[PDB]
Design an enzyme around this catalytic site. Structure first.
Site, PDB file in Angstrom:
ATOM      1  N   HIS A  14       1.088  -1.683   0.055  1.00 51.02           N
ATOM      2  CA  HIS A  14       0.281  -0.148   0.153  1.00 51.02           C
ATOM      3  C   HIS A  14       1.045   1.317  -0.502  1.00 51.02           C
ATOM      4  O   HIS A  14       0.738   1.649  -0.536  1.00 51.02           O
ATOM      5  CB  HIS A  14      -1.607  -0.200   0.780  1.00 51.02           C
ATOM      6  CG  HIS A  14      -2.059  -0.077   1.303  1.00 51.02           C
ATOM      7  ND1 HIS A  14      -3.613  -0.901  -0.048  1.00 51.02           N
ATOM      8  CD2 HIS A  14      -2.753  -1.884   0.714  1.00 51.02           C
ATOM      9  CE1 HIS A  14      -4.218  -1.133   0.011  1.00 51.02           C
ATOM     10  NE2 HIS A  14      -4.346  -2.056   0.221  1.00 51.02           N
ATOM     11  N   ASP A  55      -5.488  -1.661   8.281  1.00 50.91           N
ATOM     12  CA  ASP A  55      -4.989  -2.722   8.639  1.00 50.91           C
ATOM     13  C   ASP A  55      -5.269  -3.431   9.443  1.00 50.91           C
ATOM     14  O   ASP A  55      -4.664  -5.332   9.407  1.00 50.91           O
ATOM     15  CB  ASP A  55      -4.913  -3.597   7.289  1.00 50.91           C
ATOM     16  CG  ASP A  55      -4.575  -3.804   6.222  1.00 50.91           C
ATOM     17  OD1 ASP A  55      -6.057  -3.712   5.281  1.00 50.91           O
ATOM     18  OD2 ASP A  55      -4.130  -3.930   4.641  1.00 50.91           O
ATOM     19  N   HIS A  69     -12.593  -3.588   3.414  1.00 47.43           N
ATOM     20  CA  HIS A  69     -11.199  -3.292   2.072  1.00 47.43           C
ATOM     21  C   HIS A  69     -11.857  -3.797   0.896  1.00 47.43           C
ATOM     22  O   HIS A  69     -11.210  -3.821  -0.427  1.00 47.43           O
ATOM     23  CB  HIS A  69     -10.485  -3.560   3.084  1.00 47.43           C
ATOM     24  CG  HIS A  69      -9.987  -3.766   4.031  1.00 47.43           C
ATOM     25  ND1 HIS A  69      -9.350  -3.392   4.470  1.00 47.43           N
ATOM     26  CD2 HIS A  69     -11.363  -2.728   5.158  1.00 47.43           C
ATOM     27  CE1 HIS A  69      -8.705  -1.955   5.320  1.00 47.43           C
ATOM     28  NE2 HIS A  69     -10.198  -2.157   5.653  1.00 47.43           N
ATOM     29  N   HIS A 118      -5.252   3.914   0.564  1.00 48.83           N
ATOM     30  CA  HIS A 118      -5.958   2.658   0.911  1.00 48.83           C
ATOM     31  C   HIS A 118      -6.414   1.980   0.759  1.00 48.83           C
ATOM     32  O   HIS A 118      -6.522   1.621  -0.460  1.00 48.83           O
ATOM     33  CB  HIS A 118      -5.379   2.178   2.829  1.00 48.83           C
ATOM     34  CG  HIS A 118      -5.769   0.924   3.092  1.00 48.83           C
ATOM     35  ND1 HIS A 118      -4.617   0.259   3.764  1.00 48.83           N
ATOM     36  CD2 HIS A 118      -6.254  -0.041   3.152  1.00 48.83           C
ATOM     37  CE1 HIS A 118      -4.721  -0.988   3.988  1.00 48.83           C
ATOM     38  NE2 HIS A 118      -5.867  -1.484   3.833  1.00 48.83           N
ATOM     39  N   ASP A 122      -6.660  -0.564  -2.357  1.00 47.21           N
ATOM     40  CA  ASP A 122      -7.959  -2.274  -2.327  1.00 47.21           C
ATOM     41  C   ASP A 122      -8.450  -2.562  -3.334  1.00 47.21           C
ATOM     42  O   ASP A 122      -8.539  -3.309  -3.913  1.00 47.21           O
ATOM     43  CB  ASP A 122      -8.147  -1.843  -0.929  1.00 47.21           C
ATOM     44  CG  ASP A 122      -7.624  -3.015   0.388  1.00 47.21           C
ATOM     45  OD1 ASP A 122      -6.118  -3.539  -0.205  1.00 47.21           O
ATOM     46  OD2 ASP A 122      -7.325  -2.765   1.651  1.00 47.21           O
ATOM     47  N   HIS A 128     -10.149  -7.928  -4.304  1.00 46.28           N
ATOM     48  CA  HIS A 128     -11.099  -6.831  -3.511  1.00 46.28           C
ATOM     49  C   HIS A 128     -11.924  -6.612  -4.015  1.00 46.28           C
ATOM     50  O   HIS A 128     -12.983  -6.429  -3.498  1.00 46.28           O
ATOM     51  CB  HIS A 128      -9.863  -5.825  -2.607  1.00 46.28           C
ATOM     52  CG  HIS A 128      -9.293  -6.935  -1.389  1.00 46.28           C
ATOM     53  ND1 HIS A 128      -9.405  -5.879   0.077  1.00 46.28           N
ATOM     54  CD2 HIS A 128      -7.747  -7.432  -1.672  1.00 46.28           C
ATOM     55  CE1 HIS A 128      -8.325  -6.349   0.319  1.00 46.28           C
ATOM     56  NE2 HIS A 128      -7.550  -7.213  -0.293  1.00 46.28           N
ATOM     57  N   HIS A 142      -4.985 -15.997  -0.830  1.00 43.70           N
ATOM     58  CA  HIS A 142      -5.058 -14.905  -0.895  1.00 43.70           C
ATOM     59  C   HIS A 142      -4.165 -14.233  -0.251  1.00 43.70           C
ATOM     60  O   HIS A 142      -3.716 -13.457  -0.841  1.00 43.70           O
ATOM     61  CB  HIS A 142      -6.889 -14.140  -0.522  1.00 43.70           C
ATOM     62  CG  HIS A 142      -6.469 -12.466  -0.464  1.00 43.70           C
ATOM     63  ND1 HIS A 142      -8.159 -12.459  -0.926  1.00 43.70           N
ATOM     64  CD2 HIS A 142      -6.241 -12.044   0.341  1.00 43.70           C
ATOM     65  CE1 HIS A 142      -8.222 -10.957  -0.348  1.00 43.70           C
ATOM     66  NE2 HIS A 142      -6.541 -11.032  -0.416  1.00 43.70           N
ATOM     67  N   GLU A 146      -0.969 -12.319  -1.975  1.00 44.90           N
ATOM     68  CA  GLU A 146      -0.375 -11.260  -1.409  1.00 44.90           C
ATOM     69  C   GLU A 146       0.967 -10.855  -0.679  1.00 44.90           C
ATOM     70  O   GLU A 146       1.627  -9.697  -0.814  1.00 44.90           O
ATOM     71  CB  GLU A 146      -1.210 -10.227  -0.644  1.00 44.90           C
ATOM     72  CG  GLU A 146      -2.276 -10.212  -0.911  1.00 44.90           C
ATOM     73  CD  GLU A 146      -3.136  -9.419  -0.307  1.00 44.90           C
ATOM     74  OE1 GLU A 146      -3.951  -9.136   0.796  1.00 44.90           O
ATOM     75  OE2 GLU A 146      -4.434  -7.877  -1.054  1.00 44.90           O
TER      76      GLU A 146
HETATM   77 ZN   LIG Z   1      -4.039  -3.796   1.106  1.00 40.60          ZN
HETATM   78 ZN   LIG Z   2      -6.381  -3.178   3.246  1.00 42.81          ZN
HETATM   79 ZN   LIG Z   3      -6.788  -8.712   0.907  1.00 39.89          ZN
END
Ligand SMILES: [Zn+2]
Ligand SMILES: [Zn+2]
Ligand SMILES: [Zn+2]
EC number: 3.1.4.3
Length: 244
Positions: A14, A55, A69, A118, A122, A128, A142, A146
């Site tokens: 992010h 987060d 999110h 943010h 996302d 997302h 997932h 990431e």
């Molecule tokens: Zn994220």
């Molecule tokens: Zn997030």
């Molecule tokens: Zn995620």
């Protein structure tokens, strides 16, 4: 995307996305007032705190469910019935940030801006924008995806000053929705029968571990680059709107 450290890009996709968007603004010498980038840097601690907080704590992470999110542009919902989604949430902080900015409360302003950035970030993550969680089949994909992104993200920096200036109207919701639309169209480039089968086989095969990672790399690059250009345009809109 990940947001592992408050002030480091290492495992914080992010922050990386936002820093690259700011670099786009700095590279632009035709329409960007560079004092805007100077202000973002002046209040960087607060901006980063906001990017990270989303987060890590309530109400931003919804009791560790992260429902706010997610945002599917086709039905306008997150993965939990009746819960708040990323479009309304991202816009909320975009406005709170702007009102604080006009009132000269800079720490409050840039903290809220960070949160807004943010949420915009996302919806640029296909999973997302399609409500594919770490519990979605195949479960565990997932989170593994990431974490993998952090290992290759720095290879996809946008190196020009072409952000998506005035991409959408003056309404931030239009920008978040628009970003989600593109991200969802790109979903099948990350999640499909092939990546699913390989991810599962990676459990007992190193060959398949490397196979699904290679497969999702091209689309990951596209998503990261689009995220940078959209975020740059979004920040420009914020200053154009609230900048005295
Ligand atoms: Zn994220
Ligand atoms: Zn997030
Ligand atoms: Zn995620």
């Amino acid at each position: 995307w990940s947001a592992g450290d408050k002030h480091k890009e290492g495992v914080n996709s992010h922050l990386w996305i936002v820093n690259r968007a700011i670099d786009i603004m700095s590279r632009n010498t035709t329409l960007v007032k560079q004092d805007r980038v100077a202000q973002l840097n002046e209040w960087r601690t607060e901006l980063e705190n906001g990017i990270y907080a989303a987060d890590y704590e309530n109400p931003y992470y919804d009791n560790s469910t992260f429902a706010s999110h997610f945002y599917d542009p086709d039905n306008g919902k997150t993965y939990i019935p009746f819960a708040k989604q990323a479009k309304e949430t991202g816009a909320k902080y975009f406005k709170l940030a702007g009102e604080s900015y006009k009132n000269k409360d800079m720490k409050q302003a840039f903290f809220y801006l960070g949160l807004s950035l943010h949420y915009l970030g996302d919806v640029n993550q296909p999973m997302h924008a399609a409500n594919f969680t770490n519990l979605s089949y195949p479960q565990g994909f997932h989170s593994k995806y990431e974490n993998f992104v952090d290992t290759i993200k720095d290879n996809y920096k946008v190196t020009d000053g072409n952000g998506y200036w005035n991409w959408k109207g003056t309404n931030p919701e239009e920008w978040i929705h628009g970003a989600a639309v593109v991200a969802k169209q790109d979903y099948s480039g990350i999640v499909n029968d092939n990546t699913k089968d390989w991810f599962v086989k990676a459990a007992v095969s190193q060959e398949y571990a490397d196979k699904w990672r290679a497969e999702v790399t091209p689309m990951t690059g596209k998503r990261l680059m689009d995220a940078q250009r959209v975020t740059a345009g979004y920040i420009q809109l914020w200053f154009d709107t609230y900048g005295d």
